[PDB]
Amino acid sequence: LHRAGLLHNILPSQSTDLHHSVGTELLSLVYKGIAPGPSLDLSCKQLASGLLELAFAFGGLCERLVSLLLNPAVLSTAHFSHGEYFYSLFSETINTELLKNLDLAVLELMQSSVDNTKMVSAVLNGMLDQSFRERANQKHQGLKLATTILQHWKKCDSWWAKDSPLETKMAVLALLAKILQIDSSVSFNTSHGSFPEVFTTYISLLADTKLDLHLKGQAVTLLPFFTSLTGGSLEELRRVLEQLIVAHFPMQSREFPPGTPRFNNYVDCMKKFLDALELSQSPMLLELMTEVLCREQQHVMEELFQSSFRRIARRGSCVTQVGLLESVYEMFRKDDPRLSFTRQSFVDRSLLTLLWHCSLDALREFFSTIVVDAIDVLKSRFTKLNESTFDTQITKKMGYYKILDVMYSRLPKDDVHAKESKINQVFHGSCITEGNELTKTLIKLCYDAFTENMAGENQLLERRRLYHCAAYNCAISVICCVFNELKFYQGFLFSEKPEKNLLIFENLIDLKRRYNFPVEVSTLSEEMSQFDFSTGELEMDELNRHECMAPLTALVKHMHRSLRDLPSWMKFLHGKLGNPIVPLNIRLFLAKLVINTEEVFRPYAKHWLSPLLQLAASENNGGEGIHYMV
Amino acid sequence: AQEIFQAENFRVLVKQKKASFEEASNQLINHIEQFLDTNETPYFMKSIDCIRAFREEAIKFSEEQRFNNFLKALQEKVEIKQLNHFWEIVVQDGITLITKEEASGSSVTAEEAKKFLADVDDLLDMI
Amino acid sequence: LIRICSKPKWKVPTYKDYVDLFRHLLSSDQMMDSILASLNHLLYDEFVKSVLKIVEKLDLTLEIQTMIPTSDPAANLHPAKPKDFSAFINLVEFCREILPEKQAEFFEPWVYSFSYELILQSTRLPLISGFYKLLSITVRNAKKIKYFEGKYSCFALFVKFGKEVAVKMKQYKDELLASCLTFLLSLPHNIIELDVRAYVPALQMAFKLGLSYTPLAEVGLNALEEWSIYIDRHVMQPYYKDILPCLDGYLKEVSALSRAAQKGFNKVVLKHLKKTEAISLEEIRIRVVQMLGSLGGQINKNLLTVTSSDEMMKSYVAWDREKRLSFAVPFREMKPVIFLDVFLPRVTELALTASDRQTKVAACELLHSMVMFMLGKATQPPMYQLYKRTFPVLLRL
Numbered sequence A: 001l002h003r004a005g006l007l008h009n010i011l012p013s014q015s016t017d018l019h020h021s022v023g024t025e026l027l028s029l030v031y032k033g034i035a036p037g038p039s040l041d042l043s044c045k046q047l048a049s050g051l052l053e054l055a056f057a058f059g060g061l062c063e064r065l066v067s068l069l070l071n072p073a074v075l076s077t078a079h080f081s082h083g084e085y086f087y088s089l090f091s092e093t094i095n096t097e098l099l100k101n102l103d104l105a106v107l108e109l110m111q112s113s114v115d116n117t118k119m120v121s122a123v124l125n126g127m128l129d130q131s132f133r134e135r136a137n138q139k140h141q142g143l144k145l146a147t148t149i150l151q152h153w154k155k156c157d158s159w160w161a162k163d164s165p166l167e168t169k170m171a172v173l174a175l176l177a178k179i180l181q182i183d184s185s186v187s188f189n190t191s192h193g194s195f196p197e198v199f200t201t202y203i204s205l206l207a208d209t210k211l212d213l214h215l216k217g218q219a220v221t222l223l224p225f226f227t228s229l230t231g232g233s234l235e236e237l238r239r240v241l242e243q244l245i246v247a248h249f250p251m252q253s254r255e256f257p258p259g260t261p262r263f264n265n266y267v268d269c270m271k272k273f274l275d276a277l278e279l280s281q282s283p284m285l286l287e288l289m290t291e292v293l294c295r296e297q298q299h300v301m302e303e304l305f306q307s308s309f310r311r312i313a314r315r316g317s318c319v320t321q322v323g324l325l326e327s328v329y330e331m332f333r334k335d336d337p338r339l340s341f342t343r344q345s346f347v348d349r350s351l352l353t354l355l356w357h358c359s360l361d362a363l364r365e366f367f368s369t370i371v372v373d374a375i376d377v378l379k380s381r382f383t384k385l386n387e388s389t390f391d392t393q394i395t396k397k398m399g400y401y402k403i404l405d406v407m408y409s410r411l412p413k414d415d416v417h418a419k420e421s422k423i424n425q426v427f428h429g430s431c432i433t434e435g436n437e438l439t440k441t442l443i444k445l446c447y448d449a450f451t452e453n454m455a456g457e458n459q460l461l462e463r464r465r466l467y468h469c470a471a472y473n474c475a476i477s478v479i480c481c482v483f484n485e486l487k488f489y490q491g492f493l494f495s496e497k498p499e500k501n502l503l504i505f506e507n508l509i510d511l512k513r514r515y516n517f518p519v520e521v522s523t524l525s526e527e528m529s530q531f532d533f534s535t536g537e538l539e540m541d542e543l544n545r546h547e548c549m550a551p552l553t554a555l556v557k558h559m560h561r562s563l564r565d566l567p568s569w570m571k572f573l574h575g576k577l578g579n580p581i582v583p584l585n586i587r588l589f590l591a592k593l594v595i596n597t598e599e600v601f602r603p604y605a606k607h608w609l610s611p612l613l614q615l616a617a618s619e620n621n622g623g624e625g626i627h628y629m630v
Numbered sequence B: 001a002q003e004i005f006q007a008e009n010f011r012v013l014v015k016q017k018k019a020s021f022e023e024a025s026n027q028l029i030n031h032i033e034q035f036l037d038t039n040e041t042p043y044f045m046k047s048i049d050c051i052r053a054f055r056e057e058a059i060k061f062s063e064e065q066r067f068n069n070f071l072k073a074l075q076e077k078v079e080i081k082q083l084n085h086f087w088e089i090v091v092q093d094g095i096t097l098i099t100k101e102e103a104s105g106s107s108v109t110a111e112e113a114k115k116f117l118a119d120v121d122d123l124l125d126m127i
Numbered sequence C: 001l002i003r004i005c006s007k008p009k010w011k012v013p014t015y016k017d018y019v020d021l022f023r024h025l026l027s028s029d030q031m032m033d034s035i036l037a038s039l040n041h042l043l044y045d046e047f048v049k050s051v052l053k054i055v056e057k058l059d060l061t062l063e064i065q066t067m068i069p070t071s072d073p074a075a076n077l078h079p080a081k082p083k084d085f086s087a088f089i090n091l092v093e094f095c096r097e098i099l100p101e102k103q104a105e106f107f108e109p110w111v112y113s114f115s116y117e118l119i120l121q122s123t124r125l126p127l128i129s130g131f132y133k134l135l136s137i138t139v140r141n142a143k144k145i146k147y148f149e150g151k152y153s154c155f156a157l158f159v160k161f162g163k164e165v166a167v168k169m170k171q172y173k174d175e176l177l178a179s180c181l182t183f184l185l186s187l188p189h190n191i192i193e194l195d196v197r198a199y200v201p202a203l204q205m206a207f208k209l210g211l212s213y214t215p216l217a218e219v220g221l222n223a224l225e226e227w228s229i230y231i232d233r234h235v236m237q238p239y240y241k242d243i244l245p246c247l248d249g250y251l252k253e254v255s256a257l258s259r260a261a262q263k264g265f266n267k268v269v270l271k272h273l274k275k276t277e278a279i280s281l282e283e284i285r286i287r288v289v290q291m292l293g294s295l296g297g298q299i300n301k302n303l304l305t306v307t308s309s310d311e312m313m314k315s316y317v318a319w320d321r322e323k324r325l326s327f328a329v330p331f332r333e334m335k336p337v338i339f340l341d342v343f344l345p346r347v348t349e350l351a352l353t354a355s356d357r358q359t360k361v362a363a364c365e366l367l368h369s370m371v372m373f374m375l376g377k378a379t380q381p382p383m384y385q386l387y388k389r390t391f392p393v394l395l396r397l
Helices: A021-033 A043-058 A062-070 A084-090 A093-098 A105-111 A117-133 A141-151 A168-182 A195-205 A213-219 A231-248 A263-279 A283-293 A302-313 A318-333 A340-357 A365-378 A387-410 A437-447 A461-479 A504-508 A526-533 A549-560 A570-578 A584-596 A610-617 B009-016 B023-037 B041-060 B065-080 B084-093 B112-116 C019-026 C039-056 C082-098 C111-124 C131-144 C152-171 C174-184 C201-208 C214-229 C256-262 C268-275 C281-294 C341-352 C357-377 C384-394
Strands: C326-328 C337-339
Touching (some): A043 A084, A105 A141, A117 A141, A141 A168, A168 A195, A195 A213, A195 A231, A213 A231, A263 A302, A283 A302, A283 A318, A283 A340, A302 A340, A318 A340, A318 A365, A365 A437, A437 A461, A461 A504, A461 A549, A504 A584, A570 A610, A584 A610, B009 B023, B009 B041, B041 B084, C152 C201, C256 C268, C341 C357
């Protein structure tokens, strides 16, 4: 009859109020029947659910239903709720009547928030996960009820205030996560919902030093909803995130045994930061996370960070990619008095990953931005009178070499050879001068590194060695992308001249670190989602770890597929391996390099037996000898 | 037979209480050095609160040699580096050596604060 | 349920070892809670509600994927949501081992409901097994406890659905047909004595399909046993001359333990044995003769009054009036003449019914060779009467 609408002209209300008397008495029966005066079955519940469905089919009765939910009566049993039980018993027809008419069920529910906070939270949460459940064809009531329970957020306000029960703060956090997950990415602009008064809640729950670390780990999952903000609000959010970091994070590194009740909290909060950052490709989240990461010798979770960055760069939205790149770049390039170690860490283990995994298929953006800002600092001249600024210039130069290495290793040849825009901004502006101008300028300034002598240099030796190594790696990368058809790889990377103390291999190899060399080395996965919603190469041993073995081996294999002996790489390394007057370490290094590139030296066997054999057979090797190297 | 069967709160606590000494001093020296290495203003207020706490505990625990040695070390560090902001925030409040009688305790006004703190070229075009 | 019904180097056991857990959750229960401080009833009811929920929401329907199959189960044997389908399957076996028992008083109120919606789904999802399997589980639980001493609404439901499924079953193939037969022959039927002429083809197809699928033989045996021991002994009689004669074909290395046994016996055989349920066909024959004598000699003579020859004579007659297919097998010098006809029947029925892969392959190769032989032989002998015998087997093959 109700489907035919003939429910009232076949069953009326008397000369009474506009409410339906029949519905009122049926609903009273269903409310106080399951109450004791008990027993329960499945067919009884099927009836009673049909009975209250009938009761709601009459007319409004919604405010009466809500008053029943918040009715604070107590039913004794050895005395639990008496008003929640009516809800949890049915919990589905109830909530599909509350979602039958919005803006009044929610209003009448939240009005008594301070009185029945348990009940109002329970019913609002049930309405929420009810509406989340039916979004496939009805992702309309979800948005409306989320926005509507936001429009009254100033009513449910005592929950998140200070000195509240530190169970309703996380309760409202769970409710609020639910609300944001329902609606679209809308609650940030022009006060779509209650912009000011809802942020004040997020900022306050992530601000005060009276909450916990797991509570805010729950909180820092709102971040992917709130990283698309702008100047004022985003600056305030970044402020409060920064006080979070300073106030609750370990100062530089672990300094926590794995198991103490700080390390586990720290790892939880950090991994939640990290997966949030992997959701929202938000620059300043990279600022914070790299900042904390690249501040120790090696973070405990290095592989997590690196996989996260691999995801971050691999996303699309190329403007956001370039924003992440420029953000970490400017974090390194800036003149902040940061430690040399930390500053070079910023490029080593943060932005090289981002550059390796996505820059662009035919990128210009980042490299075009930095061409005539990093070339000029590579051309800068040192001042060996102060330790600090000299060290920082070394680190920045090293980093620029590494970044150029990454582009030249990834960027295809043409958009750095041809008459281009990516290139034409070191000389004379973007005019058509000659082509390949920065190729040759970078070649000069790189070959001038790792070949500059170190006679009078006795201040920062290991750092300068790393400088030379990075410069030489950059050189190898650019030369693999210079014209690279004739004997180009020989003039540079090889063929130096000791007339004025040009020494490639002597300078990048250590020569005083004594190697040890030990002897040997769906419609049911959906119901997963609704429960989710309503709950919350080689052996890298000691001389493959020299930051030049892998590049040199790749370069050698490349030269193999590019054209007695060959002029100065077969023959110059031949003559630096042969005579036992070259320092030991260069000779060990070249033995390692020829081992790893064995396939190259198969045609050249008759030349390549004497020096390896006399290196194995000689007695110069320290300890009991280079035994696994033998 | 008879012989075989018959974080900040933890750091605040560390600054407050410590069974030993001069190891907490060393660790806080390292902490403030790394804090001054970075340039977050919250770390700057962290450093100023730390030095205030160190001065308070030095006064309340009969010790001045540590206070003046620390002050000399930080003065030299700010002089030799680019920590102008740290020195500015220090002089905003004012931290100076004991000015009573250059000793443990006295009842003399502070005057030290004012008196001390008022070939290859051819290889290119072969392409 | 939703998980351990969804689980289809690292090893993943799927559901077969969750089972004892769930059985102790409800049945082996008084022997584990006694050390603590009922739950059996609550957990059984929760398990049944949950399984009803999952059946309610799984979209077990099927879709056709890119001839014209008359088999209603067809290429359509491909669900829309295969994860749901595998979930239902894990569900059916999980319930099958959770619900043969623990019904001492627990399944007492669930029979009518559980049935009613299994019939409702299985009527709009007809060609989906496991529905039938849950029906057989619930009817056998309604049989262990009595529940059928005349409620009557579910009685009429079972009668009508048994008739409908028994008529629809005559189309179903192996797994579906097996589930339907195990359902039908699990009705109490000492309560449905009526219209027994429609439940006999479902017992002779569960006998004929035995000899290869032993549990179907077992259900057929329990069926016939109950029909004999409880149905009235005047209506069960006319339906013996066509229920026994389909029961006649039934009556036709160096491991760790070995090394431990060889090397004496000192605690090694103990641990090796400590490290270590399809019914056996021999026991099936044993029970066939056991109840065959247990049913007397008055009833018994119907095992071999089929007709004493009906269609095995078609296998016991000369396929042709006069022999053809004379094949001179070439030796060095003599080349004697064999006849391929004589062993053509045995070869052509070894090809079809072999139950041995190597023998089947050999027999199929011979039929291939002989077919080519016999189509060659008439090219250069009126011989169609053996085509008439051998094409109805080329099409079957």
